[PDB]
Design a protein around this ligand. Structure first.
Ligand SMILES: CNC(=O)c1ccc2c(c1)nc(-c1ccc(Br)c(O)c1)n2[C@@H](CNC(=O)OCc1ccccc1)c1ccc(OC)c(OC)c1
Ligand SMILES: Nc1ncnc2c1ncn2[C@@H]1O[C@H](COP(=O)(O)OP(=O)(O)OP(=O)(O)O)[C@@H](O)[C@H]1O
Length: 478
């Protein structure tokens, strides 16, 4: 199996996480689940940045030690990801010795190589300085040879113009004004600053410089680092320069999605425009929360949350469009055939030829959207197919057909096409929604996991034997 390595940024637990953080982790999970469905050996990482004066200050104010405070915050963050059914293979913490060892070794290496020198940085304090300008041509050469490195492509030309063209100043990579962080082994009054400390989580979590580097040699380089747009230059400039200084392979892609806005702009702990994901999940369910996030933030753009948009998106798309379609279909199979779904024979009805083609066009277009990080376009395309399936009930009028015994075969064809249309949608929604597809597969009585995979969508009409649907249907949402 080809490997695929995906990461979110490590988040700062100076306060509780809100749906902005949730977006990145769900988006990372959508990509991870999608890539596992394509047959990749996937590793998916997330974590926490646990150092700096600010974390020590929060712990003191809470009347706790730094790790005591951090363990409670991280417990809540882990609980949240377990609630969101995030499929992360590991959780990296910068307080862990596996991480601290790498920060220590990397800082001492750069010191030995002459990359780092002692100096002074009113903000007036001593710091080690990283000579990054000597990697400039190498970085710009790498951009030329990897034109899809920054996503969206717009932000690459901002990097070069705003930060590189003026010239990369020597980066201050340590401080002496705080003590909560990784102390430099050579010179312990210095503490490693955020730049080296936070960035190396992506490789420290894979056991880089440990006695077992198997995860590192299997998964590095990262296929995709995802983030919000404001930490892209860390990741586009400083990160590959550090990787050059360590003679390490650079990541393939950095994706910088937009922000989840509120009425007053960016969702943030400091604007007091926070929506707690726990609340949305507890009231409206997991799928509604996951769906809203991925559907409402387009590629290369920002999106806005309002309570009115949320319930609209939840009720119209999930509960009505997909939800009624499933109930309508299972009702009719139970009423006209006593729960026995007739086997698919072929495109018997006149609309079936184009609807079957539409199903395959839906899969192909979905694939293109997913491969180009256009998640909202992928979802909207699946909903056009769901809408058309509801419309196919209205066009065919199965209740009229059920009165003529001569049209029993045609009526069975219509039932089969609804269930197969539903099946196509359920397979395609598996990366996004973790409850509804499984609920749909169980209610239609698809136990075999061969019906739930992407390769089962290559040819329309996989059910040639008659099967029995559920006699006691239920709502799929919340
Ligand atoms: C209102 N909040 C505040 O006062 C605050 C806000 C953030 C604060 C903070 C205090 N203290 C720190 C801090 C200080 C020293 C050490 Br050692 C450390 O580990 C953290 N930060 C960090 C938070 N880390 C973070 O967001 O990691 C993202 C990331 C993930 C993966 C790879 C790379 C980067 C911070 C510091 C400087 C920044 O840029 C100038 C910055 O911009 C993103 C963030
Ligand atoms: N509004 C948001 N939209 C999208 N992603 C976000 C948002 N808020 C946080 N994130 C995710 O978390 C990462 C770090 O976010 P950031 O430091 O801006 O959040 P914060 O907790 O709101 O900070 P602060 O209140 O100090 O400004 C981003 O790179 C992104 O992965």
């Amino acid at each position: 199996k080809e490997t695929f390595y995906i990461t979110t940024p490590i988040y700062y637990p100076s306060g509780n996480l809100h749906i902005g953080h949730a977006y990145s982790t769900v988006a990372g999970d959508v990509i991870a689940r999608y890539k596992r469905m394509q047959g990749y050996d996937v590793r998916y990482l997330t974590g926490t940045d646990e150092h700096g004066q600010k974390i020590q200050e929060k712990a003191q104010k809470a009347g706790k030690t730094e790790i005591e405070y951090l363990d409670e915050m991280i417990a809540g963050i882990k609980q949240l990801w377990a609630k969101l059914e995030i499929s992360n293979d590991d959780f990296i913490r910068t307080t862990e010795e596996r991480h601290k060892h790498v920060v220590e070794q990397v800082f001492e290496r750069l010191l030995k190589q002459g990359d780092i020198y002692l100096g002074e940085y009113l903000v007036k304090e001593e710091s080690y300085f990283f000579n990054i300008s000597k990697y400039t041509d190498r970085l710009l050469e790498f951009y030329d040879q990897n034109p899809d490195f920054i996503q969206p492509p717009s932000r690459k030309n901002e990097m070069i113009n705003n930060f590189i063209k003026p010239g990369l100043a020597d980066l201050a990579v340590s401080r002496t004004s705080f003590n909560w962080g990784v102390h430099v082994p050579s010179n312990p009054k210095h503490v490693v600053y955020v730049w080296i400390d936070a960035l190396v989580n992506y490789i420290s979590a894979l056991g880089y410089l440990s006695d077992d580097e198997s995860l590192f040699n299997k998964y590095w380089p990262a296929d995709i680092h995802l983030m919000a747009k404001e930490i892209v230059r860390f990741h586009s400039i400083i990160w590959p320069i550090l990787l050059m200084a360590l003679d390490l392979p650079l990541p393939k892609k950095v994706f910088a999605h937009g922000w989840i806005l509120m009425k007053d702009g960016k969702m943030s702990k400091s604007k007091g425009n926070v929506v707690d994901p726990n609340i949305l999940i507890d009231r409206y369910g997991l799928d509604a929360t996951r769906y809203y996030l991925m559907r409402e933030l387009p590629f290369g753009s920002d999106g806005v949350f309002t309570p009115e948009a949320f319930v609209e998106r939840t009720n119209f798309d999930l509960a009505n469009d997909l939800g009624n379609l499933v109930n309508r279909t299972i009702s009719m199979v139970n009423k006209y055939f006593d729960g026995e779904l007739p086997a698919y024979q072929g495109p018997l009805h006149e609309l079936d030829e184009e609807m079957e083609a539409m199903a395959l066009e839906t899969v192909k277009s979905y694939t293109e959207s997913m491969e180009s990080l256009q998640f909202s376009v992928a979802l909207s395309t699946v909903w056009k197919f769901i809408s058309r399936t509801n419309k196919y009930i209205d066009e065919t009028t199965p209740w009229v057909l059920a009165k003529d015994d001569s049209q029993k075969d045609m009526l069975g064809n219509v039932m089969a096409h609804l269930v197969e249309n539903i099946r196509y949608a359920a397979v395609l929604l598996r990366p996004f929604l973790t409850h509804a597809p499984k609920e749909i597969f169980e209610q239609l009585n698809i136990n075999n996991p061969q019906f739930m995979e992407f390769s089962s969508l290559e040819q329309y009409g996989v059910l040639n034997e008659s099967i029995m649907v559920t006699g006691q249907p239920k709502p799929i949402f919340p």
